[PDB]
């Protein structure tokens, strides 16, 4: 289990990937060339994870880049680390989806879908171990939804044998007044559910809120949305990128956080929340990083975690710090908190260290929670699915690509069967 | 002569193996590299024309990451390449994949290695295996080991040194589930398994050895330390020996009834400087406090079956005698009805030795006491409680079934678990 | 009354009266050899048999080795098949899936053609 | 009836065979090498009937030495007197019993048992007129008490016509090394009093007791114990190894002492008793010797006399002492203790008077009783056995190795008749 | 001319044996070489050869070789031809059943040959003289053995026994009394004449009237040579009163079956006192402390009575010392029996050996008399083996040698009658 090959599909996958790429390629050393230019020998070690080597010491991402129109890659091109990705990669089309899943999954996406399983086949090949794909998209475009899980059930087919892990940006009215993104995105979960393995719901509620009210951004654009996302992305992925005792793998994820197969839909958190290209003045000591990370401020999903259940958490801590004190804590927090675990589940914390912290911060903690609250964002996307769906509006956009409204209703149903799910385990008890 | 065989499965058997042989070499002066400027140390040893002694051993993972560090450590020359086996991904904490899906492909080649290991001995003992029960392969890869043993070595002796889960340590969340799955599987085919509390040997260093937060070096060359007095009384010519037959036979009534309680005594700080040597009655004494157990259990509320001391370093068998006629007529140490003259005794007369750079401190003698207890079914209860607590809900369950396994094997091991704690109701009942 | 004085070189004997008055040994040894012989006999075919017990002991055990190796041959070989055709039958129900979905897509499609 | 061929099986059989030829290889005047250093012809007349005679003038002991582990015959080949020994004369296994009866008697001592019978079939061929064999073993442990017993059974098929006597050591809790011991020792007296002449009885809980009570050890070693066991034997063995009125052979001993097939276990007793080393600073008194050779605290056996019945006697007195008291004294103890004497066995108290003291001591004496009584040995075993056998404890250890539990079931059947029948001769009447 | 072959049989019969011929050499001048410089009475136990030496008429046999060892090693080694001394290779463990049947067998036919060719030197040969103790198995089995042989072999010849009777103070084994039954009633129809020998009335004489604290076997044999001696000087020298082996069975034997005389000797002297007289000595011989066997003829009836002096002894004072016992004594004679003495008087006093116990005496006497009290020795031995037999005590022993439990029964029934008859004979 080492190679990871990288999707992003769709105008909000390629902003946050390319975000990304950026990120991660700051903390291992890798310039905009993909010359090696750090340090430390430990940003080396896992880089194979992320990265190829290629002729001239040069370190390429294991990355495919896809759009139904060329107008964001050729963004991703000129941007700061545009030209480190592989040129072979970057397939696109000319069409654009309109914001239509139906176009993206069964129409313009479909048409280009077998031009992207060539590159994903190529770059599978060269791994010597591949563990899997990993995938950033919103769920309330038509590409990245659409095409984005018509590419994941395909990958699926080919390499069953996989891990499939999604960064699935969930749509909010906040953010975005394009009135289909409740279908989309509704479309979108009933395929997930079904052909991940572990989903990262980022929600764009979620990170309009924090710049909004705790940043006090009076108006947010993406680029600040994005900046919680690429902290949070690069906080999740830390474990596999750098060496540790937990000797982290996708599989091994899925494992221990998943207890019920399409209850895999995870509530990521961070602490400390900061804004764009601004110098932190302080350090958060321990108890200060593992009270926030566990608030509903610091949540990327807008669930109230006390309003739920923890199946299972999984948090990881990054720069110089006693470790004994990060112990200390989470068995404090634990002890205080112990109504928001279920019982039974034993031992369904678990904690990591990583001694590099991210840079602009002396330490942060990421933080993975499969809840039951994240019910309480799936109930939001039904409710706003039904409004629309209850006057079949804007339905002939669907129906004129060969869509029936039966999709509609069994997407819809099978999104209300995960919600009482959640449910379920929310009310379950020891005896 | 009278050889035998150690099998290292996982990480957990791989690295208490790296300590015992560490250990083993600087008790019989065996240089990293072989070298070796009694011949009891031959049932361990095999020598080369070149003199070089070879462990008779088999280290098994996988995944390579554990045995790799073996591969290029202090002690690489001391193993043959073929004695170390690996394979490309682990079990990902799952038995299923350590029984079937990854270790079916190993399972032949770790065999073949083993039978050129048998085919050196003119008098094979049996096997001693190293595994946890809570790993995917030391949990998985151990039971299908354990049964394809049976086929080729028949009614052979095995002996099991299991490392059992502890909260404190744990790796995964499924670890109760593999415990059970593996301690089902393998009952049939193990004559006496040593069962080592990873909880027990955390409090041991924490109190004993003021380490604030033990680590796996820690823990292991604490266990180490035991294995190396079970194991003694075969590496050297002492006063008193104990071969692995006369273990069993005074060790085990029944069959299923095969699971000693290790008792270590003393347990030293190497800072500590004014602690005079303690006698052969004080060590003695101490193998029957809770303190000093290998497993947390309350055998003051149970009753003795076997009673086994094994003593190293200056010891005469005058003070043994004195020390075990004490012991009989204390009435807090109750004996079943049934079992008439409870005690074996061996003597080894080289002293414990230590690391350097360890934490124990050296002493002029030690003992260890393997006791046949009921109160070792108080761990069984602790295990299936935790079973049942995810197996109520099927937590976790769909990995294994996806792995080809039946939800009735999870029923068929738990039913096993009752049985024999069932049995172990029904051996203290009086006649 | 003193009578019969009689004498010779070495010396001389009288009476003196107070008052007058008023094959098959061979049979015997053979038929005590026969039951020597016969008890000897009996005793020596006594320990034939304790030598034959001894011979089904150590052979026991030897089939009740072979019996527990080939009930582990079996088990085993039950077990690793189960989990094949398990293994088989979920694999292959997931293709059956997936078949399904691109049986919908083409649907989909073909439909879309019609709407036009 | 002249050689003797000495056999020592086991960790014990072995101990207490190796003490016995340091013994007797002192009261002979032969050093460690074999040379004979002495001063009385009286050492030499009956040397022959535990030694060869070698080139050299060298005087070899007549032993053969088992086990199926090596460890022990390397302890025995470093001790004091290791070297006299008949190197050829050593065989040993590699396995080991692991004190399983089952192991010793059926696996892996039937491996050896022939390489054993060899070495018998050599040394009874040097003999001019052999007597017999004498076995030092105990019945406790794997290798003694099953290949031992074994070995008897061989030995009897080929030699029917020879007297087969042991020294069988008893296990007691007291002195324990394994929890099988009451199964190794029910299955092994099976053996015996179906194949076995004559049988001393050293019973481990008997010489124990002497050690804590009389001897006043504390924590009594093997050592000690061994101490105790290396003087009966010496005692026992006196007739046999130096010219006396009795002319002194294995079977008119069995004759004289045995009314009974079965009834063959003897217990028997030492005067004084003394502790390893420390020096008696006073000689005992005839009578003193003679009260002291009758009582219960001298018995080897853990078995109160006072309980049974004497059926036979043989009594031997070593030292320079009045042979006219020494028969009033005997004669005092029969008058005065008659109801513990056998009516229907007219004169069943035999004595002998050697002019030869032991190492030490200046008069000594020793007791060989054929009493009823030890049914209070067997029925110790007994009670251990079925307490055990009940819960089929431990078991799955013999039928492993082919055993049946049938077997069990008349082992504790048999030995249980033995005790009857020597309650029937306890109770019978003039 | 008359010859006497004397056969001795295991170690009492052997070494008594030893005892006898060292007394017979004394007494007729023969030196341990068997030259004697020197009357022709002694050839009757004596052959000679072409180089005059004087070799005893006699076999020595047992079923081990170290008694036999002794006499082929001592002083009288030369006295002896090789032949004469017979040995096996292991005795018979004191078992009758070894003996007679087992180890026995191995050598009868051997025995038998040496004693022809002793019977071949005879012109005309009276019977044979054997010695041998009930309690032995070599002593008990072979001699039976031996004595049925000689009947088929030797039909009209006499056969007479010199039998050690067992005692508790000297004994050697438990199963003595089952021997001593068994030996008794397979001779009883082969013997003509038994003179039985207690040991416990030898070993009271010894300490009583010798001063030996503890008596040996030495002591014990040259007693009783002594009394052996005096029952064959009227065979050996030219005699008048039981000059040949039949005139023993006429003078003493008036029934077949009561053919076991009673013998008291006297004067038995300390060496460590004025001659006593022939009153003297012959009023010794009716006291209970100079018998050779342990009974009390006062309360029995005598059927025969024979005195044998030796030494300065003439016929008034016998007859003068015979008419006071008559005036003295109640000595009841049955009433088919005169009351009578048959006295035999031999002029050659009495032969001491050297470095020996007893005092050499002017006249001796020894009593030979056929009395019912003797029957006190057979209920004594055959309570013994009642006691045991009654619960097959060592039995076993027997039967493992091939012997059959009815033997036993057998025997004892025959030792019943014979007590019987004692009575009818006595009443
Ligand atoms: N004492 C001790 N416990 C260990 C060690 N390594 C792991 N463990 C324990 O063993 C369990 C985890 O099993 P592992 O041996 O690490 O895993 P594995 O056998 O390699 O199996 P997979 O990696 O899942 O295929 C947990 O209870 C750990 O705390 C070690 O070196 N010593
Ligand atoms: N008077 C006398 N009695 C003896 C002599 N030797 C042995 N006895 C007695 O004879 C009886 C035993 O018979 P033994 O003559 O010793 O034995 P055995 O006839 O050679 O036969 P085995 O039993 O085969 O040795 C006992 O009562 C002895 O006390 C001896 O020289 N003189
Ligand atoms: C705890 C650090 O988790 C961050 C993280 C992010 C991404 C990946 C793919 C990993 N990988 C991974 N390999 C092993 C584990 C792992 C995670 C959680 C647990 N769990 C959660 C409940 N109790 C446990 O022991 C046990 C193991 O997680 C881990
Ligand atoms: C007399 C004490 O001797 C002890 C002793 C030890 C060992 C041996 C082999 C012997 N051997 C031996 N040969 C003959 C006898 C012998 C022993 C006992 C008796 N007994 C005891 C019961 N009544 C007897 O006359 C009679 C004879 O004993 C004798
Ligand atoms: N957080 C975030 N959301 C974005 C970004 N760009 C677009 N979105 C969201 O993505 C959804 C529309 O999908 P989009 O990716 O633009 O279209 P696609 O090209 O058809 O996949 C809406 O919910 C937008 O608010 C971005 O850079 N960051
Ligand atoms: N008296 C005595 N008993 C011993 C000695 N060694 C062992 N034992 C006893 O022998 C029994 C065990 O048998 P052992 O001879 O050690 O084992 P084996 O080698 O399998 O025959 C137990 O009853 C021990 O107490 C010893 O030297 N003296
Ligand atoms: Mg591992
Ligand atoms: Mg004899």
């Given at each position: 289990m080492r190679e990871i090959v990288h999707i992003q599909a769709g105008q909000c996958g390629n902003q946050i990937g390319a975000k990304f790429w950026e990120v991660i390629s700051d903390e291992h050393g890798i310039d905009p060339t993909g010359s090696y230019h750090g340090d430390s020998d430990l940003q080396l070690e896992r880089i194979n994870v992320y990265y190829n080597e290629a002729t001239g010491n040069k370190y390429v991402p294991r990355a495919i880049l896809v759009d139904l129109e060329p107008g964001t890659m050729d963004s991703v091109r000129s941007g700061?680390?545009?030209?480190?990705?592989?040129?072979?990669?970057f397939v696109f089309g000319q069409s654009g989806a309109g914001n239509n899943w139906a176009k993206g999954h069964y129409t313009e996406g479909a048409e280009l879908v077998d031009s992207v399983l060539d590159v994903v086949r190529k770059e599978s090949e060269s791994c010597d171990c591949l563990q899997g794909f990993q995938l950033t998209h919103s769920l309330?475009?038509?590409?990245?939804?659409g095409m984005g899980t018509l590419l994941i059930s395909k990958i699926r087919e080919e390499y069953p044998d996989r891990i499939m892990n999604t960064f699935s940006v969930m749509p909010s009215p906040k953010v975005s007044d394009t009135v289909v993104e409740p279908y989309n995105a509704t479309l979108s979960v009933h395929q997930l559910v079904e052909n991940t393995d572990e989903t990262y719901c980022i929600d764009n509620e979620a990170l309009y809120d924090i710049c909004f009210?705790?940043?006090?951004?009076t108006t947010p654009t993406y680029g600040d949305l994005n900046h919680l996302v690429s902290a949070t992305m690069s906080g999740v992925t830390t474990c596999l990128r750098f060496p540790g005792?937990?000797?982290?793998?996708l599989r091994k994820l899925a494992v221990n956080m998943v207890p019920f197969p399409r209850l895999h839909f995870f509530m990521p958190g961070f602490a400390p929340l900061t804004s764009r290209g601004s110098q932190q003045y302080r350090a958060l000591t321990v108890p200060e990083l593992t009270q926030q990370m566990f608030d509903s401020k610091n949540m990327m999903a807008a669930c109230d975690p006390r309003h739920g259940r923890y199946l299972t958490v999984a948090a990881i801590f990054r720069g110089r710090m006693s470790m004994k004190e990060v112990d200390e804590q989470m068995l404090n927090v634990q002890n205080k908190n112990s109504s928001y675990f279920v019982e039974w589940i034993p031992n369904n914390v678990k904690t990591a260290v990583c001694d590099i912290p991210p840079r602009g911060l002396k330490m942060s903690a990421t933080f993975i929670g499969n809840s039951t609250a994240i019910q309480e964002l799936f109930k939001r996307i039904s409710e706003q699915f039904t409004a629309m769906f209850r006057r079949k509006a804007f339905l002939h956009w669907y129906t004129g690509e060969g869509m029936d409204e039966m999709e509609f209703t069994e997407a819809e149903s099978n999104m209300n069967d995960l919600v009482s799910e959640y449910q379920q385990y929310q009310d379950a008890t020891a005896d | 002569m009278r050889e035998c065989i150690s099998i290292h499965v996982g990480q957990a058997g791989v690295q208490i193996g790296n300590a015992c042989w560490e250990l083993y070499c600087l008790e019989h002066g065996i240089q990293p590299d072989g070298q070796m400027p009694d011949d009891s140390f031959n049932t361990f040893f095999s020598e080369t024309g070149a003199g070089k002694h070879v462990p008779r051993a088999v280290f098994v993972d996988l995944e390579p990451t554990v045995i790799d560090e073996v591969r290029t450590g202090t002690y690489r020359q001391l193993f043959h390449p073929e004695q170390l086996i690996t394979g490309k991904e682990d079990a990902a904490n799952n038995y299923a994949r350590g029984h079937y899906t990854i270790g079916k492909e190993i399972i032949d080649l770790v065999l073949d290695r083993i039978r050129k290991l048998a085919d050196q001995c003119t008098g094979l003992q049996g096997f001693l295996v190293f595994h946890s029960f809570g790993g995917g392969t030391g949990s998985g890869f151990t039971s299908l080991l354990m049964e394809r043993l049976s086929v080729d070595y028949g009614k052979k002796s095995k002996l099991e040194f299991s490392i059992y889960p502890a909260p404190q340590v744990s790796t995964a969340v499924v670890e109760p589930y593999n415990s059970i799955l593996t301690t089902h599987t393998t009952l049939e085919h193990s004559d006496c398994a040593f069962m080592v509390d990873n909880e027990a040997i955390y409090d041991i260093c924490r109190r004993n050895l003021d380490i604030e937060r033990p680590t796996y070096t820690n823990l292991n060359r604490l266990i180490s330390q035991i294995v190396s007095s079970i194991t003694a009384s075969l590496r050297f010519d002492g006063a008193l020996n104990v071969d692995l037959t006369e273990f069993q036979t005074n060790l085990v009534?029944?069959?299923?009834?095969?699971f000693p309680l290790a008792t270590y005594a003393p347990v030293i700080s190497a800072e500590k400087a004014y602690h005079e040597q303690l006698s052969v009655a004080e060590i003695t004494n101490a193998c029957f406090e809770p303190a000093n157990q290998m497993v947390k259990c309350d055998p003051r509320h149970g009753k003795y079956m076997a009673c086994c001391l094994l003593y190293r370093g200056d010891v005469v068998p005058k003070d043994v005698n004195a020390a075990i006629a004490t012991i009989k007529t204390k009435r807090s140490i109750q004996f079943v009805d049934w079992c008439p003259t409870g005690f074996k005794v061996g003597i080894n007369y080289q002293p414990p030795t230590v690391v350097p750079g360890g934490d124990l401190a050296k002493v002029q003698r030690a003992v260890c006491m393997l006791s046949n207890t009921t109160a070792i079914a108080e761990a069984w209860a602790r295990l299936d409680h935790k079973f049942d607590l995810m197996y109520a809900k099927r937590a976790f369950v769909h990995w294994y079934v996806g792995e080809g396994?039946?939800?009735?094997e999870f029923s068929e091991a738990r039913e096993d678990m009752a049985a024999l704690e069932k049995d172990y109701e029904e051996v203290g009942v009086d006649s | 009354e003193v009578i019969e004085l009689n004498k010779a070189t070495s010396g001389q004997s009288w009476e003196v009266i107070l008052k007058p008055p008023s094959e098959e040994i061979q049979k015997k040894l053979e038929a005590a050899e026969e039951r020597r012989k016969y008890q000897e006999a009996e005793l020596l075919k006594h320990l034939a048999e304790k030598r034959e017990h001894e011979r089904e002991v150590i052979q026991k055990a030897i089939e009740e080795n072979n019996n527990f190796i080939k009930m582990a041959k079996e088990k085993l070989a039950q077990k690793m098949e189960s989990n094949k055709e398990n293994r088989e039958a979920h694999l292959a129900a997931m293709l059956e899936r997936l078949q399904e979905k691109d049986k919908h897509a083409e649907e989909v499609r073909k439909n879309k053609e019609l709407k036009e």
């Open positions: 700061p680390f545009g030209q480190i990705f592989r040129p072979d990669n309330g475009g038509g590409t990245g939804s009210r705790t940043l006090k951004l005792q937990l000797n982290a793998d | 009534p029944y069959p299923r009834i095969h396994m039946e939800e009735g | -």
